[PDB]
């Protein structure tokens, strides 16, 4: 039962850098070690198998290099699309994967651009009530919370959700749902989402209604 | 054309035992051997069991007790079966060939199962579009809101998956007892373009098409 | 007209290697080279154009370099899909090809799939007999089949013909084909294959008996 | 839609002159040129012969006495004509174009010829099928033996095209004065669903298909 340690477990960087993840081998696997490149919710990818064979149609930016104990990852002038988890995997006796590493990348800085959302008429019928606001695409991903209903902060309601940095556009998204009874909605009137970023100097304000439709 | 499929329960009871099913399809048992890989959720990859192209059983040492791999080469599949099942055994389990020359290559989709005595709950799917007043600003932001769920996972697409636009799919969080996630996706023909969420719950084995309206 | 020495004739390269085959003008040629490619029954196609100029198709792990005299292809990484032959051509005055060289790759042990076929009574109908062994998808290349009948090795009749290493597994496959006449078939009664393979350890025998047809 | 094709009697006897023809196509031979390069069966590629966009011509300082090329710029095709045959003449003739810029860009199929004394034999495609007592593993290796035919080449695939995959088709090999050759593929669902080769030997016009039963 050969341990691999695999060391980066988060890596931060800017578009264009070469970054590099090792893996060592409690044993002298050999050769045998892998590399793959894992986005959420979908099934491992393999980009290099034997330390530095490339797995056809991986782009030649990545690379391995290894022996024995001791082995390297690395991808030189990073893009927007390689942020995603890695691992490493020994195959010489057995199989053993690494802990992985979250590789990040650092953007420009961006400001979220905060949505709100009343219950829909259709839970509202069923008695209940369910307030949720979006700010979605922001960098960093460092975001305040804020329930004002008529003035008043309440937080015994709230579930905050951030999501994964999109390999798209380098940001975050997050989301915030309220929830509360369907007769607790009707003794208010006043719904302030409300955020402030380190990119705002204030908050960002954004209310509904309640009356309407 | 080489493909694997892994069948099984979203959500089993403790103590139980869970049996999986990998289906393999471009390639022969018999010259391919087949692996278990695990993934808790949030966690990362935990090889488990290897079937070689003979027919002979490996597994990881931290389970290599309540663990068994067989297969019915007559039909192509691989079966895992584990008991004395616990909590921390709830994540997406996988299977891979191994060809003797190419490893790890070929997975399955996998297959989430969760360890719990709780009983499956399907999602409440809501539509989020404007308030009743709040003008559109051209490009509108719209979601659902897929909540009061379990066990994980339930993933959701729009328009069938021809929108894509800006998904921001957002990670479920439990309540409680149950799950609450929202998928959200921006887009301008909308009024007039029909948006709409594809939720799915496979614990459950229910799928929910929530048109987000007008208002 | 003008003499084109290539080298190497042939080549076993490890996956991932980085592969140069090289072609020597015996004159002046400027930068009149290109270079082709052929996989077996296929006509030859062209990778590289004017000793660098990549033509499409052609992925960027392939590049042509040279000077004046002096010239090669390079494969940064060679994949199991480059197996084949290659070829420069000269088309600085009249033209000229290399002798070419062939491209094999080495793999890791694969034991052949052995699979042994009586006669069709169609063909005994006809007064002869063919019993076809196959060896198929095996690595390495060297391999050894004699036919035993009820227990005596029949050197005669037999047919070999094996593969070129298939570019898409690095593997070989083999034919045999035991002939004689339906007389000399009938009178007979256990047909075994044997094959000899490094994989093996004990000969692997595949065998069928004509009273069971 | 540029495309060239060969084509012409792929059988001669020692000593006797060959005719080939090499039409093309999406282009005029008015503004390309054609060559014509010839690969012995194992050997490499040879050019011999090549005519210029004008309709000038240009052959392999060593073969050059025994040969002639031309065209019919008009029906868009270019002639070669070999004096003289001996057996290490056999080989594919391939015609390619030139045009001044991309050289050898677009080639043909190749034509096999034959220079032989043999004469013109069709093939014999038989089943190749387990039996006999034997096993199975639901996924099995089945084949046609196509044997006994003259000269090269013949053509196999299998279920006219439905998934052609793991098919082995052999070299042919030369024994006794005649070819043979073995195609293989690899079932999972036969004999329920049929398995069935397709066989051409165009050299006897012989275009034949052998089910695979059992």
């Known amino acids: 039962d050969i341990q691999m340690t695999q060391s980066p477990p988060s890596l931060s960087a800017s578009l264009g850098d070469k970054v590099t993840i090792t893996c060592?081998?409690?044993?002298?696997?050999?050769?045998?070690?892998?590399?793959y490149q894992q986005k959420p919710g979908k099934a491992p990818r393999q980009?290099?198998?034997?330390?530095?064979?490339?797995?056809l149609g991986t782009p030649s930016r990545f690379s391995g290099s290894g022996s024995g104990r001791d082995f390297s990852f690395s991808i030189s002038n990073v893009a927007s699309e390689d942020i995603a988890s890695?691992?490493?995997?020994?195959?010489?006796?057995?199989?053993?994967?690494?802990?992985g590493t979250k590789l990040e990348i650092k953007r420009a800085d961006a400001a979220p651009t905060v949505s709100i959302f009343p219950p829909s008429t259709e839970q509202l019928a069923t008695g209940g009530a369910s307030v949720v606001c979006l700010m979605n695409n922001f960098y960093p991903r460092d975001i305040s919370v804020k329930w004002k209903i008529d003035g008043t902060e309440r937080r015994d309601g709230v579930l905050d959700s951030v999501t994964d940095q999109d390999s798209k556009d380098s940001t975050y998204s997050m989301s915030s749902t309220l929830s509360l009874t369907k007769a607790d909605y009707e003794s208010h009137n006043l719904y302030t989402c409300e955020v402030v970023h380190k990119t705002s100097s204030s908050p960002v304000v954004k209310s509904f209604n309640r009356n309407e439709c | 054309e080489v493909k694997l499929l892994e069948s099984g329960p979203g959500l089993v009871q403790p103590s139980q035992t869970l049996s999986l099913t990998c289906?393999?399809?471009?390639?022969?048992?018999?010259?391919?051997?087949?692996?278990?890989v695990r993934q808790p959720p949030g966690k990362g990859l935990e090889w488990?069991?290897?079937?070689?192209?003979?027919?002979?059983?490996?597994?990881?040492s931290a389970l290599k007790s309540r663990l068994s791999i067989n297969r019915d080469t007559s039909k192509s599949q691989v079966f895992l079966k584990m008991n004395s099942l616990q909590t921390e055994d709830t994540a997406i389990?996988?299977?891979?060939?191994?060809?003797?020359?190419?490893?790890?290559?070929?997975?399955?989709?996998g297959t989430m199962v969760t360890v719990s005595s709780a009983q499956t709950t399907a999602p409440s799917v809501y539509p989020l579009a404007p308030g009743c007043g709040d003008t559109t600003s051209s490009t509108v932001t719209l979601g659902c809101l897929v909540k009061g769920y379990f066990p994980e996972p339930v993933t959701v697409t729009w328009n069938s998956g021809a929108l894509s636009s800006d998904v921001h799919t957002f990670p479920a969080v439990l309540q409680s007892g149950l799950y609450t996630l929202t998928s959200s996706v921006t887009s301008s023909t909308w009024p007039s373009q029909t948006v709409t969420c594809n939720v799915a719950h496979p614990a459950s084995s229910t799928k929910v098409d929530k048109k987000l309206e007008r208002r | 007209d003008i003499q084109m020495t290539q080298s190497p004739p042939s080549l076993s390269a490890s996956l991932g290697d980085k592969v140069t085959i090289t072609c020597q003008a015996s004159?002046?040629?400027?930068?009149?080279i290109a270079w082709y490619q052929q996989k077996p029954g296929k006509a030859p196609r062209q990778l590289i154009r004017?000793?660098?100029i990549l033509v499409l198709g052609t992925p960027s792990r392939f590049s042509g370099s040279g000077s004046g005299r002096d010239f090669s292809f390079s494969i940064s990484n060679v994949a199991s899909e480059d197996i084949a032959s290659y070829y420069c051509?000269?088309?600085?005055?009249?033209?000229?090809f290399g002798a070419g060289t062939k491209l094999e790759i080495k793999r890791a042990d694969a034991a052949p799939t052995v699979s042994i076929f009586p006669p069709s009574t169609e063909q005994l109908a006809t007064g002869g007999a063919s019993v076809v062994c196959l060896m198929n998808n095996f690595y390495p290349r060297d391999i050894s089949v004699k036919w035993k009948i009820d227990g005596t090795e029949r050197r005669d009749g037999v047919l070999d013909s094996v593969t070129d290493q298939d570019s898409k597994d690095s593997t070989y496959s083999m034919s045999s084909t035991l002939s004689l006449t339906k007389a000399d078939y009938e009178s007979h009664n256990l047909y075994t294959c044997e094959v000899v393979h490094k994989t093996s350890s004990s000969p692997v025998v595949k065998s069928f008996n004509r009273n069971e047809c | 839609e540029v495309k060239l094709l060969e084509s012409g009697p792929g059988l001669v006897q020692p000593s006797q002159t060959l005719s080939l023809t090499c039409t093309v196509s999406?282009?005029?031979?008015?503004?390309?040129?054609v060559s014509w390069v010839r690969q012995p069966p194992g050997k490499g590629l040879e050019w011999i012969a090549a005519?210029?966009?004008?309709?000038?011509?240009y052959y392999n300082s060593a073969l050059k006495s025994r040969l002639s090329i031309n065209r019919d710029t008009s029906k868009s095709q270019v002639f070669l004509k070999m004096n003289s045959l001996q057996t290490e003449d056999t080989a594919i003739y391939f015609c390619?174009?030139?045009?001044?810029?991309?050289?050898?860009?677009?080639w043909g199929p190749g034509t096999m010829v034959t220079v032989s004394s043999a004469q013109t034999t069709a093939p014999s495609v038989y089943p190749l099928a387990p039996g006999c007592g034997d096993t199975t593993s639901s996924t099995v290796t089945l084949g046609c033996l196509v044997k006994g035919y003259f000269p090269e080449p013949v053509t196999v695939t299998w279920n006219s095209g439905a998934l052609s995959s793991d098919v082995h088709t052999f070299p042919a090999v030369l024994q006794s004065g005649l070819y043979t050759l073995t195609s293989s593929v690899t079932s999972s669902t036969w004999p329920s669903q049929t398995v069935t080769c397709n066989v051409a030997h165009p050299a006897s016009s012989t275009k034949v298909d052998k089910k695979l039963e059992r």
């Open positions: 004159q002046d040629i400027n930068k009149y």
């Open positions: 051509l000269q088309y600085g005055n009249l033209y000229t």
């Open positions: 004017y000793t660098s």
């Open positions: 005519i210029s966009s004008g309709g000038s011509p």
């Open positions: 390619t174009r030139e045009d001044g810029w991309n050289y050898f860009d677009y």
């Open positions: 999406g282009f005029p031979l008015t503004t390309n040129g």
